[PDB]
Amino acid sequence: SETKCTLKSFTVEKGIYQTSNFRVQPTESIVRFPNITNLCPFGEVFNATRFASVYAWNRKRISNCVADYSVLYNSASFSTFKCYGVSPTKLNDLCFTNVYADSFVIRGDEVRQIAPGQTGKIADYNYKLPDDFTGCVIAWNSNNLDSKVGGNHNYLYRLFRKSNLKPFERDISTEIYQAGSTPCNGVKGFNCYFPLQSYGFQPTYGVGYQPYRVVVLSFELLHAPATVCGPKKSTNLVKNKCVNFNFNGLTGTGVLTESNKKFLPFQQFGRDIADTTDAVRDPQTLEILDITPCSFGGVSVITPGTNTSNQVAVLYQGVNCTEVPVANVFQTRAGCLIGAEYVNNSYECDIPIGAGICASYQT
Amino acid sequence: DCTMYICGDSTECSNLLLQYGSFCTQLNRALTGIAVEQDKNTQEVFAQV
């Protein structure tokens, strides 16, 4: 039927016809990545003995590390994880340039004001967010340790401020604010307000009044080469089976076999004259491997006259038949031929095949 | 080969190649004419006897 359709006719003449080129599908997809070691210590960030306060939130830079967000996400110690700029699931996928972490302790009542595009005391006095806040916010409660029976008065918050400051702006001015018209001089007086007021956390406080440690991991976009991002997953290694191999971010197909070539300590790739990849180095165990895209061919249907007979033969041009059952046997220089019997008599050629082999229709 | 050279092992690429029509069939016929003609040359010179 393949020949009868390709020729676009219901009559098929004697000869050999070319149709239905052959390939081999791969099995699975394999990924290899290095031992991922350079992870920055988020443990000392999360388990710090004392966090900064909301008036003077600390700014810390995180660079050239692996920010493993899986441990952060799957941990149940967190109370909420609201993350606005990007999807929380894809944090470890896209690789980022730099991350700045702001750590502070606030009440649970003002947790709403942390969100972008929100109004509140801490959303208008100290902590400001842009309309396009891309950073990622984390919050959890640590009442048992943070709260003091006598009241932990070390923490402070901005009571009265002169104006609403721009996002990512920290102020140190603790001068006596002048809410009234008359100027204020000295330490106290009429309409003389201290800009900072103290938190008092007690175990008797309910939800909202309890101390909540809130940390935001803001980041900047593509003004420098990306270096900070999560881990790259790695799977087991397989050989002698053509697969969709992915080494260090290059994709391809072929059988991975052991190669006796010797590279240089820093060399990674292997290439031939025709400028294509033929070798690769495993990013975990330093070894030299050879690649070979899984094989492929076509189909040559040998048939006599349609009126004479309808039996056909299939020859795969230049294809070894040790892998034939993917789609009588005989192996020749032109390939492996099936469907026809080999004899020892010698007649004249009727349908050429190759390398001296000539098929025909005879008893 | 028709699509292995241009859109090998890619399902998406073979879709846009098919829109060009009979370029695939015509090209394969052109190469076959040259290949078959070569056996005519060798037969014509040496098979005098």
Binding site: G297, Q317, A355 | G8, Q38, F46
Partner: peptide, 30 residues
């Protein structure tokens, strides 16, 4: 045989087979 679909076919007459014609031609003319 190659990577990107390219294939080379063997000739119908083997290199030894054409050596029989040359000997036959030279034997007849001698």
């Amino acid at each position: 045989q190659k990577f990107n679909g390219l294939n080379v076919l063997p000739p119908l007459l083997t290199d030894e087979m054409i050596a029989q014609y040359t000997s036959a031609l030279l034997a007849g003319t001698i």
